[model samples]
Target: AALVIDNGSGMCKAGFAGDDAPRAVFPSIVGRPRHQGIMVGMGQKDSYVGDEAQSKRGILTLRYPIEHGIVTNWDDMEKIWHHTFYNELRVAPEEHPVLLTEAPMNPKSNREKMTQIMFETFNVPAFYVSIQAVLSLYSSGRTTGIVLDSGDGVTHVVPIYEGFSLPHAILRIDLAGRDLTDYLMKILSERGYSFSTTAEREIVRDIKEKLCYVALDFEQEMQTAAQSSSIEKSYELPDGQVITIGNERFRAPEALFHPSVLGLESAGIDQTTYNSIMKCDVDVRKELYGNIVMSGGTTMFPGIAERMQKEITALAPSSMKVKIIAPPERKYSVWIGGSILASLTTFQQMWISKQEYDESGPSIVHHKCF
Candidate 1:
């Protein structure tokens, strides 16, 4: 079976194609011992990836190889990919074709470098790279639609038509789940809670994921919270300390609708979605508006889809239709799409075989993948 890997800034999802879900999903982060070498007393490996990296947060210095959905540190990234292939999936790269997911507007040079690494380093027989939005739209079984992917590092609003992306209209927003976690931490710190350690930061992220939610009406929710602490919820920390969260719950995720709250200069996601749609050909505006697709972990918040639908509908022409197709498993949409796409017998012809790479070099990716 072909292998699929959706490497996001926050999480990495990998599995064999034709599977319902990714077999291995973990944070896209790497960890190395602070002291290095024999000085390491705990018998831990010199380097770790995913959950093991997260587990040794205090002892090992953590690093994120990808930032804002683009690879920054290739060495750490190779560490992650190495772990995914050997320790996690136990697959020999030379035997299976690999389908890797890429972010929108990814640098051409980056793609070429990845192609080189996969073929030269891993010696994979075949490989293919795809954009997240295109695969996400395909995951829903639609070739034409708009994809709103709000992941950990960035949020992308991309419009696709019949399986191809509209490059000019694609919008990238810097604020995403990471920013929300920071915002929640900020609010909690203001209330005398301290998230000073890396492990504590992870805890805060967990709090945001479990407690925070998008507000249907921000002002109304604030008013209700201010009137009574009925909506307030208490969460206990790992050390047995409990903290109270009230308006902060909705206020943190509210940054998605109001980037001003987080000091970001870009427009909110909904406005950007509207702008992306309007920037496309006028003929597809109605369909784009009607076929809005949601994917990524940040988009999993309760009421986020409905809130987006309502806001975009308000911004769009009154006669136009606005819909948000948020699948139950949207958090894994990109990986799921890769799984579905790479498994098809017809798609077998799409892979860039080793012979093709040997003849055309890395430039073949641009021609074949797009």
Candidate 2:
């Protein structure tokens, strides 16, 4: 009786104990027929894994359950929720304790609904909901550190001190994979290339994942970008035609460090980290300024850690220490952390039992579960 779930907007990772990795990682997207209740999307079946669903994305009308890292539409999400759980568990009611992961400062309604579903649908004897960011502290064995979670919807900076989140220091910027893709779409369209009829969005994202690198000298890079030739970069469409892209292809990813390019009001992670450190208590702030952890899919881009370290170090006092730790599998850090917590005897003490759930209910779960 072992199961852990990491329900993130970009992916839903889950598996039983002793497995090398998650058995299933479905896209957070769920496609319900316009009027029918049937669910359609990736991970719906064995044939619908990774590239399969992605290939058919244009044909399917998908409703992403977890948008911007929160549940927005429950009615459409019911199928995805059910499928993700049952696919791995394969058990009836009243089984073992279930470990689930959620974001820090998650909405109360969402937490309550998740509790209700686990008890009502799965009939689990106990349920534990832990913040993924906090779990990362335990996973990395770091007593004090900063976690930068850059995913599909937003990039969230969570500072953990002695295994707890600093609520006042939490910061979220609306710079994510979706924002990058949208910007790429506009850039492509303005250049007379149309993604509306082709799979160019996927091509762009793949290129971003493979080729985009954080610039060590941003201003110099920007100057070079202005003089770069548009014909040098071309993406081949699925229909066998090649379309030329320009240096504008680099603009969206660059916006992560410089939000002004996208016309956003929020400060980038480099500045936010600096400001958050200054706001922390002096002792912890000193430690936090030196220990920054990059844990998310977006951090996988080439030269990201180097760029972040260089920029952040420049912003800090010359004497202050600055370092960035890059996780081996950055995208699944939170999920892997949850799995690690589930295996620990001491960590198991953090879980809330069904009796506790029945007595305290959802309200107490939110305030006390942590």
Candidate 3:
């Protein structure tokens, strides 16, 4: 079976193609004991990856191998990928064809490096690299659309036409799921709640997910926030202190529509989506507007699609119809698309064989992948 690995800045999802869901999901962090010589017998290994790394945060210096959706450290990435193949999936690389996902703006140099690592180091039988946005769009069963993918590290508006992305039309916003969490943390801290420790931050993350929802009318919501006892949720901290969260629920996710709240002088997601569609040719603009696909973990916030559709409808031309598609599986759409793709009989020939790499070298990825 082919292997599908979609590694985001926050998490790594890996599984055999044709599965309904990824068999393994883990943090993308790699942790190595800080005091290399001090505690060899303290039940600490030389290096820890993923869930183990997440658990041993206090004992080890945790470093993410990927950041903002790009591989920054090759050695740490190697460790994560190695663990994915050997330990997590228990699959030998040489026997399986592997498909990996990369960000929309991934460098050519990075792809070549990725190719070399997959074929040269791991000796995978066949390999292919797919763009995350394109894969995300594909997951929705469409060849043309604008993909609004807001994951942990970054948010991208990628316009795809006939299975290819329009590079010039693509736009990115630095605000994303992680930033929203920090915003929540900041607001809660001002109210005397502390999320300084790793464990506490993790709890704050849960609070965000369970409590946050994008407001339909932010100003109206803010005015009524004081009287809305219905909106308050009492969360019990680990120390048994109960904290009440009210307006902060809608306030944090509001940053997506208004990044100025987070101190970023930038166009919001709605405006960015409108601008990105305008950059495309007139003939395809309407199609892009009609198929505004939502893909990412952050997009899972309740009412996110409703707010985007509501805002974009006002911004678009009167004649154009704007529709935002939020699939139930949008969170893992990248991996699912790659999974469905790598399993296709015809798609198998598209993979760059070891012979091709041997003949053309790593640069061959540029030609084969795009």
Candidate 4:
């Protein structure tokens, strides 16, 4: 069995290849101290992973080894990886082959460093890295597609051509970036109780992830949204604090499809998705439109695909058709794709071994994988 990991800026999910879901999914965040009297982890020196960092935060400052979907802090990342395999998954990384997902245009240096970590640090026998966008396309059983991956930290649009990802044509969206998170901040602010930043941040993220849903009929949804008492859902805070959420539930995520609802000036995912395809040749426009595949955390919002299809069709030229392949378990589509890729018996030759790394050095990964 192979350990497959889908690495994203906001979170990383790890599981055995051929599994439907990841066994261990943890935030990319690692907690460390800024001052005294701040609790880190039980019987630990500095950093914390999994629930420790998420469930508790006071004296410890949150650290993200990956910023803008790039890993820049290898020293801290080593600790995160250790905690992931050793504590979270309870498996020896050396025992299984590893499959890790990377960006479509991941820099040469980043790929080298990643290989070094697996080879020198964990001493894994075999390893392979694949682009998340390409894997996302594979999840939909398509060799070519326009993958709209709306991640928490950033939304990346990649145009894949027969299993090849066009990194140069890729575009990033900020509308789903801090733009969405700030909308969440106001959700808590208007509620009349401002809790600790750490706790409130976690709570807001949860509310967005769990309670939020996209509205296909925004006009109709809004008409009924005002009746907050009917649609309100209750959430119990860690301190036993109960909060009721209503119109805010749908309206928050609605901004991804309809940015005007939140007074945002930027275009949402639909407009941006079209913009990404426009950069390509006109010959492939129809194929791109028809073979659209979606992947990522928030992209799984209920009714979001229908909303995307609606918005995209309205904006598309007359007589043109629009389609979306929003599969079940779409939130883990990239990991699922890794599973599909790794489980293929023929893919065994793709893995680079410890001997290969020592013989050819880190640059071997880019050429062989690319």
Candidate 5:
């Protein structure tokens, strides 16, 4: 009856409502000039999406529609979603209701635009939107956990109670996976390494993913890194040069805890998490403290759960206990939760019907769904 989608700044996931996983997973990048790519001469295709765009990026000029959780370019976004359903996944948008995910702090104007697109552009019979952080909490089978989501563009510390986000308790930071990778790039650049292409950007991303991890004992890791060659990982560059990385593997990720290290003024993620909890009702603080769930790609560092648990617990009140749960398939936790939610029969009534939108306007979304 409905299609489920988790649209993120870095990427997007789409599939049927009851499906365990997305039938289509693709980058949100939109490339200009349809004259490039493998299907140019096939006579049926032109502009690329996802892997195709990424593959031809060396030649094509690309545009990113969504940035920092907002869709800045509607034309590009409209094309991307259209291609995903019609060209990529082979689905008719008018045939099914759609369940989409959005940022918790998303503005009302953006909501109106999104609703208009679903109803007017796609002509869907019904649609509903859910907050991404809350969906991550639901993914772990909990409607009452403090969700710490660190994705590509930003890190958000969001608390969910009975399936809704605590708006006052929500907080965001600039530190995240892209920031870490850029910091790593800076570190590498200073160490005599250089890269000049988009492919190199991905090379650096792979380096971060393969080499980064949280340091349980930061100062001890420095000592271990100095004394042991085992802590060093070598990355082979495009020019066949191998650069052996040392303490920076753990140090780059360290910026997430100490943003000032990279010149950002905000307190570390742990401190912000503690501060956010303090803003909420006193009765829920203990429950929020004890049932923390870690989500998003940046939180995939090997020792992040234990590291966050240790730091967050240290900041907690004596009466409260801290626990961090790292769910399986951590990066896709929100999508997983959206799948669970969209599959429920009783949840169908919550969707904004075409008639409802016609009667009340796009603003009906705010009253009908959360």
Candidate 6:
């Protein structure tokens, strides 16, 4: 049997035998020496995994294959992928099929290269790839629903019909967890705290994840965060260093709503949801608007539902009902969905075998997928 790979920018999820949880979930990063033959950071190579990689980022020569939610440089990335898979799986290359996940509206060249790598280098017998948002919709068990996949790289909103993606209705916001981290880093630096080291960046990210919330009223939250008494939040660094991190704090995560701080011209999630709902067919608008699902890493932030509901209610027509649901494991919702889909007897037909590849190539894979 093949394994499902949710090759997300922040993390790569993979497991054998269709496990509910991935066997290996590592950071989507490859640390390489600036010079060849001579390894950097000892023979150990200073490779960091998942959250750990984010912590040691400043000192590591991190090579992220997926930038802005799509794979770019194939050579460097393929090397990392091969190394990680072999090291983690401890299995021969020809043992299993690979089901790699991608973002919606993924570039053709990138998809072609990904398929080539899996088939040619890995010697996989079959390959299956699909959009992460679509998998999330499937995971929600909603035949017709809107999925907001907000993760480190980007926030993508995709609508699904039955079991497939409605490409024309899909929407993507370039801002996401990365933007939030960057914004917080800037605020801390401006307030006399510096993130010149990976350790600093990790500490800031930890604070953002643990303490940040979606403010119903940005101005009010800013006032509260600025107050001396209220600004008493402190974070402990890895080296047992305790740093007080609150003066001039303006509700960091809430800036996603007011993207103007980041100098982004795009509308926030609430406004974007309203526009997306309006774009749906008039007859199905009510149903679609009522079935809104939020999945992804960023959706885990506190008060996101209430904030989204408040803004959506104000923007949407009173006659149109709206609901926003955040699943228990928002971060892995798409992976779960993909697992469920892969388990289905019908889904097996969608996968392309090696024989099909030899006869038709990437075009056939694209046709069956899209």
C-alpha TM-scores of all predictions: 0.95, 0.86, 0.93, 0.86, 0.91, 0.90
Candidate 3 least-lDDT 10 residues: 35-44
lDDT of each: 0.87, 0.71, 0.85, 0.79, 0.82, 0.74
> Backbone clashes per model, in order?
0, 0, 0, 0, 0, 1
lDDT of candidate 6?
0.74
Off by over 4 Å in 3: 34-42
Mind giving the per-residue lDDT tens digits that candidate 4 earns over 1-370?
9999877677778888899788888887778756665454546555677567875666566666876667878887887778888888888998898888776555679988998888889999898998787887778888779999877666778987776556667877545534566687776577775744755666677777777788888777778867546777878867788887777778788788767767756678888888888887787776888888888876878888899888889888878888899888777899988999999999988898877888888888977774
- The candidate scoring highest on TM-score is 1
Q: Taking the tens digit of each residue's C-alpha lDDT, what string does model 1 give over 1-370? A: 8899988789888999999899999988887777646645656566888898787677776678988877899898887888898889999998999999888787788889888989998999999998887778778998689999888988998898886658999999889898888888888888889897666778898999888889999999999998989879989887799888999989998899999988888989999999999999999896999889999999999999989988998999989878799899988998998888898899899999999999999899988995
Which residue window of length 10 is worst by lDDT in model 5? 31-40
Question: Per-residue CA lDDT of candidate 6, range 148-205, in tens?
Answer: 7887788878766566546677778888887888888888777677776445555676
> What range of 10 consecutive residues in model 4 has the weakest lDDT sum?
37-46
Give the lowest summed-lDDT range of ten residues in model 1.
36-45
Better candidate number, 1 or 5, judged by TM-score: 1
Off by over 4 Å in 6: 33-59, 197-199, 247-250
Cα RMSD to the true fold for all candidates: 1.8, 4.1, 2.1, 3.2, 2.6, 2.9
User: On a 0 to 1 TM-score scale, where does candidate 3 land against the true structure?
Assistant: 0.93
Candidate 5's residue-wise lDDT over 137-217, tens digit each? Answer: 777887698888887776888887776558878998768887787788888776777755555666788889888889987
